[PDB]
């Protein structure tokens, strides 16, 4: 319950270098919107969505260099903690995460998310929990469509 992390903010930094079309240790417009696909970005390939991806360009340029820098990549990060549509690619992860297991443990998440995003998704993931159980683990695959407790109402 505290948003993005100094560690979530300190390994998503090196993103910076990861997208970087040219590696000039910064992500300009065409090279900041491919950054972002990987992250499950709120905008996509469609005229609607480039023009608020520019209204983010503006946001992520504190520095009026017109290219996104590392401080200006967690702006997006943050932002992470709700919900989208391409959120479907990046919650794919939870399988390589798990390997070959049929669930994943809330530390597995807490492994690759140190931030709120953990969180989120343990509150979404199905209750794998009981004696036969072991303490905290979820069903990645299997989780809840219908959020953590909006249901039964
Ligand atoms: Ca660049």
Redesign the pocket.
Same mark, same amino acid.
């Given at each position: 319950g505290s948003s993005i992390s100094q560690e979530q903010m300190n390994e998503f930094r090196a993103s910076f270098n990861h997208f /970087?079309? /040219?590696?000039?240790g910064?992500?300009?417009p065409e090279?900041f919107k491919a950054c972002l696909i990987s992250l499950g970005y709120d905008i996509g390939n469609d005229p609607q969505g480039e023009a608020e991806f520019a209204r983010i360009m503006s946001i992520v340029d504190p520095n009026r260099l017109g290219?996104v820098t590392f401080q200006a990549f967690i702006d997006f990060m943050s932002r992470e903690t709700a919900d989208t549509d391409t959120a479907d690619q990046v919650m794919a992860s939870f399988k390589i995460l798990a390997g070959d297991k049929n669930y994943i443990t809330m530390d597995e998440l807490r492994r690759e998310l140190p931030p709120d995003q953990a969180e989120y998704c343990i509150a979404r993931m199905a209750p794998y929990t009981g004696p036969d159980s072991v303490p905290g683990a979820l069903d990645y695959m299997s989780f809840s469509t219908a959020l953590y407790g909006e249901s039964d109402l």
């Open positions: /970087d079309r /040219d590696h000039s910064t992500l300009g090279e290219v």
